[PDB]
Design an enzyme around this catalytic site. Structure first.
Site, PDB file in Angstrom:
ATOM      1  N   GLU A  96      26.939  34.620  39.014  1.00  0.00           N
ATOM      2  CA  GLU A  96      28.196  35.612  39.014  1.00  0.00           C
ATOM      3  C   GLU A  96      27.718  37.020  38.504  1.00  0.00           C
ATOM      4  O   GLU A  96      27.899  37.969  39.133  1.00  0.00           O
ATOM      5  CB  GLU A  96      29.477  35.186  38.471  1.00  0.00           C
ATOM      6  CG  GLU A  96      30.284  34.050  38.860  1.00  0.00           C
ATOM      7  CD  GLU A  96      30.819  34.632  40.346  1.00  0.00           C
ATOM      8  OE1 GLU A  96      30.814  35.623  40.581  1.00  0.00           O
ATOM      9  OE2 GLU A  96      31.463  33.669  40.951  1.00  0.00           O
ATOM     10  N   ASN A 100      38.320  38.743  37.977  1.00  0.00           N
ATOM     11  CA  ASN A 100      39.277  39.577  38.814  1.00  0.00           C
ATOM     12  C   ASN A 100      40.286  40.581  38.037  1.00  0.00           C
ATOM     13  O   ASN A 100      41.099  39.956  37.427  1.00  0.00           O
ATOM     14  CB  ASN A 100      39.702  39.075  40.107  1.00  0.00           C
ATOM     15  CG  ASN A 100      39.911  40.225  41.208  1.00  0.00           C
ATOM     16  OD1 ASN A 100      41.176  40.157  41.501  1.00  0.00           O
ATOM     17  ND2 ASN A 100      39.019  40.885  41.662  1.00  0.00           N
ATOM     18  N   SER A 149      40.221  45.859  43.765  1.00  0.00           N
ATOM     19  CA  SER A 149      40.336  45.381  42.512  1.00  0.00           C
ATOM     20  C   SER A 149      38.937  45.231  41.982  1.00  0.00           C
ATOM     21  O   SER A 149      37.838  45.474  42.883  1.00  0.00           O
ATOM     22  CB  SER A 149      40.911  43.793  42.494  1.00  0.00           C
ATOM     23  OG  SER A 149      40.244  43.059  43.365  1.00  0.00           O
ATOM     24  N   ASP A 176      35.810  43.130  39.434  1.00  0.00           N
ATOM     25  CA  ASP A 176      35.345  41.701  38.887  1.00  0.00           C
ATOM     26  C   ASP A 176      34.572  42.365  37.560  1.00  0.00           C
ATOM     27  O   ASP A 176      33.642  43.224  37.693  1.00  0.00           O
ATOM     28  CB  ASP A 176      34.305  40.765  39.993  1.00  0.00           C
ATOM     29  CG  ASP A 176      35.304  40.392  40.654  1.00  0.00           C
ATOM     30  OD1 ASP A 176      36.465  40.264  41.031  1.00  0.00           O
ATOM     31  OD2 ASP A 176      34.431  40.355  41.853  1.00  0.00           O
ATOM     32  N   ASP A 183      39.480  44.876  48.183  1.00  0.00           N
ATOM     33  CA  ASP A 183      41.200  44.991  48.051  1.00  0.00           C
ATOM     34  C   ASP A 183      41.049  45.991  47.260  1.00  0.00           C
ATOM     35  O   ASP A 183      42.593  46.422  46.592  1.00  0.00           O
ATOM     36  CB  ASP A 183      41.405  43.605  47.917  1.00  0.00           C
ATOM     37  CG  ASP A 183      41.270  43.153  46.548  1.00  0.00           C
ATOM     38  OD1 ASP A 183      40.405  43.690  45.773  1.00  0.00           O
ATOM     39  OD2 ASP A 183      41.814  42.351  46.064  1.00  0.00           O
ATOM     40  N   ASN A 215      35.907  45.195  44.760  1.00  0.00           N
ATOM     41  CA  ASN A 215      35.927  44.367  45.983  1.00  0.00           C
ATOM     42  C   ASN A 215      36.549  45.471  46.947  1.00  0.00           C
ATOM     43  O   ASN A 215      37.176  46.377  46.668  1.00  0.00           O
ATOM     44  CB  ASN A 215      36.946  43.084  45.601  1.00  0.00           C
ATOM     45  CG  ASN A 215      36.236  42.280  44.830  1.00  0.00           C
ATOM     46  OD1 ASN A 215      35.273  41.613  45.071  1.00  0.00           O
ATOM     47  ND2 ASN A 215      36.885  42.209  43.482  1.00  0.00           N
TER      48      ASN A 215
END
Length: 129
Positions: free
Chosen positions: A35, A59, A50, A52, A48, A46
């Site tokens: 990750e 998120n 948002s 991480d 959309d 991301n």
């Protein structure tokens, strides 16, 4: 902070992650590896909108507030910047809520595609725990 494999394993164990919800420590170290590459300061936006955050790439749409994700729910009740700290306590507390969310570790796409069903034990092999 960029953790070492065994250093992280020990910090997560100390924080009660070993076998939390049936997931052995190897699973958590494997997920962190893919990750964030063991880097607490990692961030990734991301499509959309948002983002991480941190070691476990939590998120902003559901778990933390970064002040720039319309509709975020902030279920962990913390600013996303807290997840980038060298102290992993917040990332760990939030991950515990996420993994208890009903879909387990599948919540982490890298875990699902790169750790799930592999010999996760190898990730803690050689460490003094």
């Amino acid at each position: 902070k960029v953790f070492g494999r065994c250093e992280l394993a020990a910090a997560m164990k100390r924080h009660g992650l070993d076998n939390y919800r049936g997931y052995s420590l190897g699973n958590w170290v494997c997920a962190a590896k893919f990750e964030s590459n063991f880097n607490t300061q990692a961030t990734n936006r991301n499509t959309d909108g948002s983002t991480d955050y941190g070691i476990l790439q939590i998120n902003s749409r559901w778990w933390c507030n970064d002040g720039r994700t319309p509709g975020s729910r902030n279920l962990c009740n913390i600013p996303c910047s807290a997840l980038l700290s060298s102290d992993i306590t917040a990332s760990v507390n939030c991950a515990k809520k996420i993994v208890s969310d009903g879909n387990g570790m599948n919540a982490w796409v890298a875990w699902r595609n790169r750790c799930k069903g592999t010999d996760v034990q190898a990730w803690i092999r050689g460490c003094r725990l």
